[PDB]
Every structure is written in structure tokens, then in C-alpha cells.
């Protein structure tokens, strides 16, 4: 068989930079290497094949270069739309064999996220559970941190979180937190809040409601 | 216009038989050479074989042992992969793929857009859909929740409102289920004025869910 090693793993670059991808094949392939792009939640799209032939309407940005063992997909004048995960596939010999992929993630400004908080529905209340969810819209970077506070009291261990891909288009991410109770312990207390911080605020902004 | 597309996604019970379908359009199958492909996130990318038609000839995986064939049928423009003894670590996505072979090269031009397949002992359950209400810019949502398998298919206003969504990646609960929010930002000029529908789409349930989403009163 042929292994691929692919690196790195992801990256994070600014607009307008080269980045450089590397598949590492177990032996010489003769060049017989393509490599593809896969947008987020998407199918993959080709690329270049035979290592360096661009594909008629792939842009002139991506090029692929290699021989041997080492090839390279290098991709100039980063642009946002260019988010994805980036994989190499030897035709050398089967079975074909994929590089694992490197994660291409866009450095930008700082943007700060717009906080939004959702009481449960009253149709779901009827069921006996109740879900609270607050909403960090198009914010960079990543990192962000969503504490719950039920009477102003610090709660935990009844939340999952979840994140989007990249944004293709400013680059941002949006993140939900999503806090499930009974409806007995939901009844249990009044204020129901979303404290966020994030390099973009100015100070932790705080989205409550109370119920009734 | 060459586009690929594989049966819709499904549960499939263990030690049963995965069996899917790519319908390609713009393209004969009696051409080329066409595979199928699935991806996990820890597994990357695994090829599965390749089927050339006018020969039946066929090229398999051997990670695949003997589990795994793929036929086609050149009238329909279809071609198929039936994976017997399905097991927890075939859950995936599934690609069909056309593969040009030029020379010595072999690469692969179209993708379809995948479909995901889960294995499990389990049995298929339809979401519940509830309204995220809001309250210059608002913010609404749908709660697709309590779920099984993935995954489900979030439109709003039947594909009329596209700009400003954000699905989000479903989460596993405790309960086994899946759940996730659909959440839009709309001007709040017009929360009164124009009518909010989530198209929640279920397919491993054939189970289509519609949602309004209006401010609560009082
Ligand atoms: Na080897
Ligand atoms: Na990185
Ligand atoms: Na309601
Ligand atoms: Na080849
Ligand atoms: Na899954
Ligand atoms: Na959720």
C-alpha cells in the first residue's frame, strides 16, 4: 500500500498570504497525485491532477508542484472564500489512498458577537423540558466564553455549546449554548441570563429574561 | 451541467447491508470510471473501488474484504454500492464520484454531494421543532430537537430566505438524541409584517417538519 502523510494538520493565515500544503507519499509516485478542495459542509471539488495540471476553471491562485515522494499544493492570494479543507490522493497504486487533509482557517479583524437570548417555547414546555438558548452571532475570533445564570447564580453541567464552520464570506463564526432544564426545576427560579465575554466587547454583555 | 447524486440518507440496522444509489445526470455511465467514497473525521478519506461499466470490470479496497460490490444500470444512468455485515465503524458519509483515467493518471472530476450513512442497533425517531422568538436587527430561530440518526435539513420560507442563516452542528445529548438550532437575523422591521416557516427536513425519517416562528404575546 501507499501511505500519505499530509501536514499541516491546519493552518491560520491573514488575506492576501501563500500558504503551502505537503502530502509525503511512502515511495515515489510519478507524479500520479491530485489534490482537492472541500468547502465546509460541502462535497470535495478537484483541483490539479498528475500533480501539477490544473483543472480548466480552477483559478490560477492554486499550483502543485512535486516529484518522487514530496508534492506541494500552493495557493497565493488568500482569499476568504478559500476556507476549506485541502487533501492530496495518490493513483499510484490500489487501493488510493487519501492525505488527511489540512484545514485552512483565515485570520481577520476582530469582531465582536451580537447576543441574542431565546426562552423556551411554550409548546415544548407543555412536553416537561424546557430549553434556553442564547446566540453569539459572526464574532473573531474563536474563542469566546458563555456562562448561564439562573437568579444570578452562577449555573453549570446543564449546557452544550456548538459552533460553526468559518463564514466564507467575513470570515466570522456564531456559537449557540444551549441550557435544558425540567420544567419543574425551570419553575424552580424567575431570571434566566447569558453572561458572554469576547476580545470584542468592551465588557461582558449580559442577555436576560424572566419568566412571566 | 454533470452532477451526481446518492440515495437519500438512512439508518442501517447492524450486520445488515448498506446499499445506496448515485443517479448521474449530464454524463452516461458507459464512459469513464465511477467509485464510491466515504470520510469519517478520523479516518479522512476512504476509497472503496472503482466500477467501469461497458466491461462490468471492477477494483475493490481490500480493507473492504469481500463485504463490498458495486454494479450499475446503463439505461437508468445508475450505478450502486451494497456493503453486506454493516458495522458501527461504517458510519459515514458517502461519496459517489466520477474518475477520469488519461495515461497514467487517474483522478476524480465530479463529486456528488454525499449522504450520510449511520449503523446502529437503534431505530429512527423524527425531530421536534420548536420556535426560537424573537426579542435595528432581530434574531429568530428553530430547536430541531430529539432526534435520530442525523441528519436533518434546515430551509426557511422554502429556500426564499437564504441570506444571515446559520444551521449549527447537532449536538449529542445524554438522551441518545441529537438536537440542533437554525437561527436567521432578519431586519426587525418586518418581524410583524413577514411570516417566518422553518423547512426541517428529517430524510432517515421521511419525515418533513414545518415551523412558524412568530414573537410570543401576551
Ligand atoms: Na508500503
Ligand atoms: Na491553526
Ligand atoms: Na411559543
Ligand atoms: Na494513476
Ligand atoms: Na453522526
Ligand atoms: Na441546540
Known amino acids: 500500500d501507499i501511505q500519505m502523510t499530509q501536514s499541516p494538520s491546519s493552518l491560520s493565515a491573514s488575506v492576501g498570504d501563500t500558504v503551502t500544503v505537503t502530502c509525503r507519499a511512502s515511495?515515489?509516485?510519478?507524479?500520479?497525485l491530485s489534490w482537492y478542495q472541500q468547502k465546509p459542509g460541502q462535497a470535495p471539488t478537484l483541483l490539479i491532477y498528475?500533480?501539477?495540471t490544473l483543472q480548466t476553471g480552477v483559478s490560477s491562485r492554486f499550483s502543485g508542484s512535486g516529484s518522487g515522494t514530496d508534492y506541494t499544493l500552493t495557493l497565493t492570494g488568500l482569499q476568504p472564500e478559500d476556507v476549506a479543507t485541502y487533501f492530496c490522493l495518490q493513483d499510484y497504486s490500489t487501493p488510493y489512498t487519501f492525505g488527511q487533509g489540512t484545514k485552512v482557517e483565515i485570520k481577520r479583524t476582530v469582531a465582536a458577537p451580537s447576543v441574542f437570548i431565546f426562552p423556551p417555547s411554550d409548546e415544548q414546555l407543555k412536553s416537561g423540558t424546557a430549553s434556553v438558548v442564547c446566540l453569539l452571532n459572526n464574532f473573531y475570533p474563536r474563542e469566546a466564553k458563555v456562562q448561564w445564570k439562573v437568579d444570578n447564580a452562577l449555573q453549570s453541567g446543564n449546557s452544550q455549546e456548538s459552533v460553526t464552520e468559518q463564514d466564507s464570506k467575513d470570515s466570522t463564526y456564531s456559537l449557540s449554548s444551549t441550557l435544558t432544564l425540567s420544567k419543574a426545576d425551570y419553575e424552580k427560579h424567575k431570571v434566566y441570563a447569558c453572561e458572554v465575554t469576547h476580545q470584542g466587547l468592551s465588557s461582558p454583555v449580559t442577555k436576560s429574561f424572566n419568566r412571566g | 451541467q454533470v452532477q451526481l447524486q446518492e440515495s437519500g440518507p438512512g439508518l442501517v440496522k447492524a450486520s445488515e447491508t448498506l446499499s445506496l444509489t448515485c443517479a448521474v445526470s449530464g454524463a452516461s455511465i458507459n464512459t469513464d470510471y465511477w467509485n464510491w467514497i466515504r470520510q469519517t473525521p478520523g479516518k479522512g478519506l476512504e476509497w472503496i473501488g472503482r466500477f467501469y461499466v461497458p466491461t462490468e470490470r471492477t477494483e475493490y479496497n481490500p480493507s473492504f474484504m469481500n463485504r463490498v460490490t458495486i454494479s450499475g444500470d446503463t439505461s437508468k444512468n445508475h450505478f450502486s454500492l451494497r456493503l453486506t455485515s454493516a458495522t458501527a465503524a461504517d458510519t459515514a458519509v458517502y461519496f459517489c464520484?466520477?474518475?477520469?483515467?488519461?495515461?497514467?493518471?487517474?483522478?476524480?472530476?465530479?463529486w456528488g454531494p454525499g449522504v450520510l450513512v449511520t449503523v446502529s442497533s437503534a431505530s429512527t425517531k423524527g425531530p421536534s421543532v420548536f420556535p426560537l422568538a424573537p426579542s435595528g436587527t432581530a434574531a429568530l430561530g428553530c430547536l430541531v430537537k430529539d432526534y435520530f440518526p442525523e441528519p436533518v435539513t434546515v430551509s426557511w420560507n422554502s429556500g426564499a430566505l437564504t441570506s444571515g442563516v446559520h444551521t449549527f452542528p447537532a449536538v449529542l445529548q445524554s438522551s441518545g438524541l441529537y438536537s440542533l438550532s437554525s437561527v436567521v437575523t432578519v431586519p426587525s422591521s418586518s418581524l410583524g409584517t413577514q411570516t417566518y416557516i422553518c423547512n426541517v427536513n428529517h430524510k432517515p425519517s421521511n419525515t418533513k417538519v414545518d415551523k412558524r416562528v412568530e414573537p410570543k404575546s401576551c
Open positions: 515511495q515515489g509516485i510519478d507524479k500520479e
Open positions: 464520484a466520477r474518475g477520469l483515467w488519461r495515461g497514467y493518471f487517474f483522478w476524480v472530476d465530479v
Open positions: 498528475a500533480a501539477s
